[PDB]
A paper describes a structure:
The snRNA activating protein complex (SNAPc) exclusively recognizes the proximal sequence element (PSE) at snRNA promoters and recruits RNA polymerase II or III to initiate transcription. The vertebrate SNAPc consists of five subunits: SNAP190 (SNAPC4, PTFα), SNAP50 (SNAPC3, PTFβ), SNAP45 (SNAPC2, PTFδ), SNAP43 (SNAPC1, PTFγ), and SNAP19 (SNAPC5). The partial complex, termed mini-SNAPc, is composed of N-terminal third part of SNAP190, SNAP50, and SNAP43, and is fully functional for PSE-binding and snRNA transcription.
Finally, we solved the cryo-EM structure of mSNAPc#2 in complex with 35 bp human U6-1 PSE-containing sequence at the overall resolution of 3.49 Å. Briefly, in DNA-binding state, SNAP50 constitutes the scaffold of mini-SNAPc architecture and it is surrounded by SNAP190(144-502) and SNAP43(4-147). The subunit of SNAP50 does not have any known homologous structure, and we divided it into three domains, namely N-terminal Lasso domain, middle imperfect β-barrel domain mainly composed of one α-helix and eight β-sheets, and C-terminal Wedge domain. However, these zinc fingers function as the structural component rather than PSE-recognition motifs, as illustrated in the structure. Unexpectedly, in SNAP190, three MYB repeats of Rb, Rc, and Rd dock into the major groove, whereas Rh and Ra mainly take part in SNAPc assembly. The first one is R445 of Rc domain, which forms hydrogen bonds with the purine groups of CG pairs at positions −62 and −61. Combined with three MYB repeats of SNAP190, mini-SNAPc binds tightly to PSE in a sandwich mode of “major–minor-major” groove.
Numbering used by the authors:
A (entry chain A): 144 to 200, 240 to 254, 263 to 271, 277 to 502
B (entry chain C): 4 to 147
C (entry chain B): 28 to 66, 77 to 109, 117 to 237, 242 to 411
Write the structure that this text describes.
Amino acid sequence: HFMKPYFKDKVTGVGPPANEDTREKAAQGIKAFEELLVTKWKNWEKALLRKSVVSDRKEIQDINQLPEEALLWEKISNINFAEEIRKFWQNSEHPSINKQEWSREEEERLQAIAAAHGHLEWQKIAEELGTSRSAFQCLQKFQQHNKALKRKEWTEEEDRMLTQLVQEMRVGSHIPYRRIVYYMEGRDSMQLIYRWTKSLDPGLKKGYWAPEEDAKLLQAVAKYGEQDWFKIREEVPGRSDAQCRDRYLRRLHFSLKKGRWNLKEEEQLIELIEKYGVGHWAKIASELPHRSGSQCLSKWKIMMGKK
Amino acid sequence: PPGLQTDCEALLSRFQETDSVRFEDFTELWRNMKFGTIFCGRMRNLEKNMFTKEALALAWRYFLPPYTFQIRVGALYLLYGLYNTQLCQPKQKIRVALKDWDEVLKFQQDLVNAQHFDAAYIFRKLRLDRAFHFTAMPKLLSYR
Amino acid sequence: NFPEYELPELNTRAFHVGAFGELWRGRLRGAGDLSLREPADSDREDAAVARDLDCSLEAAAELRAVCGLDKLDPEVIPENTDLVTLGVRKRFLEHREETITIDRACRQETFVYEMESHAIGKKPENSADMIEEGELILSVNILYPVIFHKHKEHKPYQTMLVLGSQKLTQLRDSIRCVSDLQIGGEFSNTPDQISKDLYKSAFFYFEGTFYNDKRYPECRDLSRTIIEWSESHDRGYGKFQTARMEDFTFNDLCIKLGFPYLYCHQGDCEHVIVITDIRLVHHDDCLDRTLYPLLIKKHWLWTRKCFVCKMYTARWVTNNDSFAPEDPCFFCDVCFRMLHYDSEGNKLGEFLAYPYVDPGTFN
DNA sequence: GCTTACCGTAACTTGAAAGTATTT
DNA sequence: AAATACTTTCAAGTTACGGTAAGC
Ligand SMILES: [Zn+2]
Ligand SMILES: [Zn+2]
């Protein structure tokens, strides 16, 4: 009622005429808030669009026995119901817009040809490879499949940038990571969450574990029973969730034999790799009575080394 | 606020019945029903603050003149207890308007006037320990 | 100037704010019970009550004894019976612990709490910057303009606390809107390359009178059009008046509690202001002057990602483009230059591209 | 030869804000 | 057509893995 415009004539509600700064600003090129949101079209809208297009698009006989295949602007759009139809239908375009499920064989051709063509003129490649698509869809697939847009490696120079941003944009405990990723080059929210929470924090402690820390960790685990490590992290003085989980599970457990191998455990490990698989170690360790997940992988590598 | 007014009216009636008001006698009910455990529900911070402010506002509402002379003193005791046992770091505070203050002071001086110094000293201590927010109106206002 | 209800439960009759503040200070400060100082004691306080309350000393001693505070397992719900609240809380906690694996402070709850309570109890590093003892505190509500579809049903708002002795312009400066950072020219055949602070001219509307900003020479006046139109022939809004904004402070502003006043800045962008709950300064709130105004509430708006990557945030918006399926399609800086340029601007001629400073990242 | 912290991503998860199919 | 619902998304995290570059 009182939102926009605030001043509306009681009888009519037109609102005051345009300002001077308003007309100048619109003439410059700046866009309002309402110009960047557009309503989406429901299913019935698409059905009506298609049937109107079909109806619009001996000869007396030709009219009436027309098959639905062969046939398949302001007049329609205004009187029946206005340039999105000129784009929606031309880009929905039942006859020739078929973004079918991408079979695996087309992906290799798309990637190789995109790399060899210089990653340019996407209309040209989308017309060269003859893939029944558009230029946009090829680029979307190439970007979703791309393996060169991220970094996945933390250097010295970008840790400092992360620290500066998270120290100038931290209100209380609230840390907005997405605004940082906007200010942080070539990253995303997941990697910043990982880095700050696990490694880059000034508060956290990085070093060896003393027996007193071990005793406190054992008491905390016996309190909580090997679940909810984010709660357990509180008892241990400053160690992170990942440190506590990894240390307790794969280093400190009550019964996990460690040290040099023998012949019999080698027997079981080799057979079990040849049976449950070679690429996964969780199950391989799960059946092995003593050794853990990491130890089986290390031992297999040492086997390969010996060979 | 899951039905506070039920417990509030229960305690206020159980103390109305006596007609022998004194802080020796209200604290007996406060410990016999142990109303001081109402703030030990293992709650977070936001719910803690909201619950405390709702309880204090309700007790204040019950303090005002349009009640009897018996409810008002019990509600004053309830204000004292709730403000004193709330578990908050920046303790939430009761909300006094402007149209109330003159009559509140009149009631206080009338209560001091006749040898009833218990509630008198209670109110004086509440005022002296800077427990109030002096606002134009009791509740926040906005169209919707 | 007693502030009472005009409408039944929602509105307050107008009142000169300064008179209200002076009325409180005169009515209450005479006893010395509002001060901004953080804190044989027994018998001395006993003499104090025996002299102020004016009861014989015996009764004062008896009361200072029997009142006390002790007469009236921390976070555990006991078996206590006659507490409906405890029963309900216990049931909810049990149902919560049996139906959740990972329970902690969610992002929204911690956001709102750590936003509202992140300055209380602060003290001025300087000593000459501390707030006075009797100055007021006003809470204002500033509604967002509509940015998404849903804001048309449950429109959001932002809240900030403004003192009673500082001018209007110190709130005009601190109202954060994205429409002070829009730069979008038209970059189509020039991919590489002042802001919307070239022209800055705004105004308030409080109880009929317009407050304009004529500090620096610009297209300063903005309330002339409404004065021209809405009252010469309409005969519907009485009479308005002008007064330069940088001349008045908040005490002079005769207002009402809970009414939608106006704030129009940068042409036609309009925010609806709903002032509520003015009070006196306590000794707990952040005692300072260079932090006010400060905001204690905000909205966690979403962010727009590029239509192709769906991994970065949008930086360029293209209108009337022959590639994309939708008309206002947004892009990052990689998709744009990788799809729209063949080592040269405007691969296809019918193509408009503008920079796009999204609100979700600037709020 | 072995062990020991560190490293980094895939996939779940809690829940308000925002979409949107249906109601009289 | 106002009002009501259900199901999407967004953005903090949290957990379970796969390896690394070290140590004696
Ligand atoms: Zn604005
Ligand atoms: Zn992109």
